[PDB]
Amino acid sequence: GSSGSSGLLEIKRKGAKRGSQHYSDRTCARCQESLGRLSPKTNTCRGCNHLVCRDCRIQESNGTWRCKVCSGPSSG
Numbered sequence: 098g099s100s101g102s103s104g105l106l107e108i109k110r111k112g113a114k115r116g117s118q119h120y121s122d123r124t125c126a127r128c129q130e131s132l133g134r135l136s137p138k139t140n141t142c143r144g145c146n147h148l149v150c151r152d153c154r155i156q157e158s159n160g161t162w163r164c165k166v167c168s169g170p171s172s173g
């Protein structure tokens with residue numbers, strides 16, 4: 098005769114109870130800089146609707162602008 102069994106799980110979550118005040122940050126999407134002073138609402142790339150600074154974007158016509166990755170060359 099013979100037999101054998103096994104099995105186990107590992108749970109790991111944030112830890113802190115359900116209550117995270119200000120659990121959101123605003124950092125560039127190309128340089129991940131501190132966009133604190135800057136405005137993320139307006140600093141949104143119309144291309145990929147992402148968050149970038151006034152340094153990782155390019156000025157375009159029709160008062161539009163896109164991120165280097167967008168306005169710049171193609172990227173896989």
Ligand SMILES: [Zn+2]
Nearest residue numbers: 142144145167
């Ligand atoms: Zn973009």
Ligand SMILES: [Zn+2]
Nearest residue numbers: 125128150153
């Ligand atoms: Zn940037």
